[PDB]
Amino acid sequence: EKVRDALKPPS
Amino acid sequence: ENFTTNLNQLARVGGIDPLIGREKELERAIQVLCRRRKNNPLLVGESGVGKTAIAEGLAWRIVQGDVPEVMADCTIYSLDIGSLLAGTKYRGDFEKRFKALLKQLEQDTNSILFIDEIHTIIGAGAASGGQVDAANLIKPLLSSGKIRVIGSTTYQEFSNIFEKDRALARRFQKIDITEPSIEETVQIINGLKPKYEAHHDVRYTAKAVRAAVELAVKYINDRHLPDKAIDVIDEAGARARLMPVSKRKKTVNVADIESVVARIARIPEKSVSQSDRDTLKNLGDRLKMLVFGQDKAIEALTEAIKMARAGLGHEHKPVGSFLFAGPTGVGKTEVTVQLSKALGIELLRFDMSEYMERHTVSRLIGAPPGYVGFDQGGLLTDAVIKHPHAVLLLDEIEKAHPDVFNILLQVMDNGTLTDNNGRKADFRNVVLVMTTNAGVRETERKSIGLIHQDNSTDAMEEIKKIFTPEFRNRLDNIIWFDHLSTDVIHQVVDKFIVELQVQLDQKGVSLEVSQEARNWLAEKGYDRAMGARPMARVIQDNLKKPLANELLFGSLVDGGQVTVALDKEKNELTYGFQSA
Ligand SMILES: Nc1ncnc2c1ncn2[C@@H]1O[C@H](COP(=O)(O)OP(=O)(O)OP(O)(O)=S)[C@@H](O)[C@H]1O
Ligand SMILES: Nc1ncnc2c1ncn2[C@@H]1O[C@H](COP(=O)(O)OP(=O)(O)OP(O)(O)=S)[C@@H](O)[C@H]1O
Ligand SMILES: [Mg+2]
Numbered sequence A: 001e002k003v004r005d006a007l008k009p010p011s
Numbered sequence B: 001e002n003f004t005t006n007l008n009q010l011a012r013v014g015g016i017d018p019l020i021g022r023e024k025e026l027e028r029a030i031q032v033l034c035r036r037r038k039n040n041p042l043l044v045g046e047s048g049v050g051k052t053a054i055a056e057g058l059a060w061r062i063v064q065g066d067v068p069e070v071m072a073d074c075t076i077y078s079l080d081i082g083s084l085l086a087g088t089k090y091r092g093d094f095e096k097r098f099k100a101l102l103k104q105l106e107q108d109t110n111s112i113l114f115i116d117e118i119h120t121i122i123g124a125g126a127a128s129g130g131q132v133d134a135a136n137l138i139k140p141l142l143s144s145g146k147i148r149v150i151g152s153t154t155y156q157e158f159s160n161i162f163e164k165d166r167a168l169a170r171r172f173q174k175i176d177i178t179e180p181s182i183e184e185t186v187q188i189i190n191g192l193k194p195k196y197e198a199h200h201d202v203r204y205t206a207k208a209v210r211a212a213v214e215l216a217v218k219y220i221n222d223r224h225l226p227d228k229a230i231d232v233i234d235e236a237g238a239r240a241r242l243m244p245v246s247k248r249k250k251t252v253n254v255a256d257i258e259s260v261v262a263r264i265a266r267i268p269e270k271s272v273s274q275s276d277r278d279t280l281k282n283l284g285d286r287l288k289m290l291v292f293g294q295d296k297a298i299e300a301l302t303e304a305i306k307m308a309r310a311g312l313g314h315e316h317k318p319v320g321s322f323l324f325a326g327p328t329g330v331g332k333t334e335v336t337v338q339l340s341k342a343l344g345i346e347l348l349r350f351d352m353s354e355y356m357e358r359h360t361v362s363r364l365i366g367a368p369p370g371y372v373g374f375d376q377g378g379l380l381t382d383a384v385i386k387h388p389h390a391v392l393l394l395d396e397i398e399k400a401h402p403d404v405f406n407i408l409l410q411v412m413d414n415g416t417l418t419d420n421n422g423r424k425a426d427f428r429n430v431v432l433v434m435t436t437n438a439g440v441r442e443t444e445r446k447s448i449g450l451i452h453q454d455n456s457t458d459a460m461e462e463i464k465k466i467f468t469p470e471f472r473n474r475l476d477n478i479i480w481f482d483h484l485s486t487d488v489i490h491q492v493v494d495k496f497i498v499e500l501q502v503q504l505d506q507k508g509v510s511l512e513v514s515q516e517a518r519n520w521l522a523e524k525g526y527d528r529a530m531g532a533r534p535m536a537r538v539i540q541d542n543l544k545k546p547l548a549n550e551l552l553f554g555s556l557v558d559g560g561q562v563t564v565a566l567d568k569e570k571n572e573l574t575y576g577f578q579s580a
């Protein structure tokens, strides 16, 4: 259930 | 770009080892490269077979020119997936990098993309928002067929990840790659040999390569033949290279490779040393000074061990499988325990009274059904894997559920017990001893008559009732243990007294027992039906009990020099204590 998340900035 | 890697350029400078054989595999890939539909080939096989080498080997053949004229000029690129994701911090960076690469390939129409572990791209670039997977970007071009790619996957994969998305699987053409034969492997090693010889500055003998392939497949069962043999060859050169002199051995010969396989497989090496040769020679007398009587059991145990080390042994069965039955108080267990000590190997014990239920037996091979925890290992398999050379004692085997026998049946006949995780345990070097008390009641039973009959045969019938014919057929010997004789008991008394002396030595106490007193203990404590266990009780009441009082409060608190003697008139011992 616990999953890591990778984000990305717009620019 | 930096992400892509031109395999052809790498081969031109010797960065790819040459390919040997697998011509049919290359032909199947090349035939698939030129087919109008399902142009993409997929190399599927077990780990360490050569699937990755074939893709790189193809580029090696192309530069050499020993390929079809159609493929005379076909550049093969290798994708570094890690580099693709290195700087994909900002949105659209992954798409720009991946789309820029695909556009480059379609323009040429000769360039082909080799992507190892093709299953990995099924989830790349799934950070957030657009969630444009790498497979999604490549799928349009692959459907049209403008771009050709080459994949590699294991049998574990291609079923849980790649086959989930039928879009990719339909385009790719599966190719089954299987480990080569033993004869083929020798050809491969000979071809790769000059590169390994130069790195280690040694010359491998022709016989050595045959031994490496034959020995490794025989004993190293956790890996496949191509890499497994090469590992032995690579390590063999390094061993000679690290000798104290610059180069003690400039070439590798037979019986040298055996040493490498022994370390990798943790099996006793051949060419037994004087240290272990004398140990095996004296292993019949060293045990006879600790276990008295039951000489037939010691010889059966030591002969099976001597046979295995000598080289005459069962191909797939263990060194020996024995069933030790008989009355209580006899050295059925003790002889097994002392055997491991004499040999200097780990003793694996398993009280089978704790494996009466069916679920308990499963623990040996694997964890309970759908166990949430990660510790899904087996108790028997792990111990054997941790100690392939050991004495696998299973005391009170009769108590254990019948299912345990079904496990031992495949062990005694095949020597390998695969676990739930697929790991194969090797029992070829583990002595398998099982002690049973079945029929013990008959041994102590007294007949209704003037003469007490033997009753040993009756006990054997009970043993046959529990142990089916199949199990008894796979047992090297079913050693019955004879009752302890009076002469033996006198020897046993010395053993217990010696143990007492060791306990006393830790307290600075020295004990001397007259021979007359020893016979008194033997006569009082000798029970044929109950064996040697009563003797220990006799020593407790007569020797340990008075000493204990003196040790706690008396002359033996910090002293010693105890002297025991029996007066014939009262047939009672006489304990003499010296304060010292
Ligand atoms: N001519 C050859 N024929 C067969 N195997 C070879 C040959 N040359 C090298 N190899 C072996 O093949 C290895 C290359 O990896 P592969 O055996 O293709 O497995 P792999 O691609 O690493 O497997 P995964 O990780 O399960 S996809 C080399 O390091 C050798 O062990
Ligand atoms: N032949 C022997 N020589 C010396 N001590 C012995 C001998 N046989 C048994 N003993 C001693 O007797 C005790 C128990 O011996 P074990 O071999 O462990 O008994 P066992 O065969 O497991 O008994 P059961 O009743 O059959 S389960 C220990 O103190 C042993 O050292
Ligand atoms: Mg590989």
Ligand SMILES: [Mg+2]
Pocket (backbone or CB within 6 Å): B332, B333, B395, B396, B435
């Ligand atoms: Mg026992």
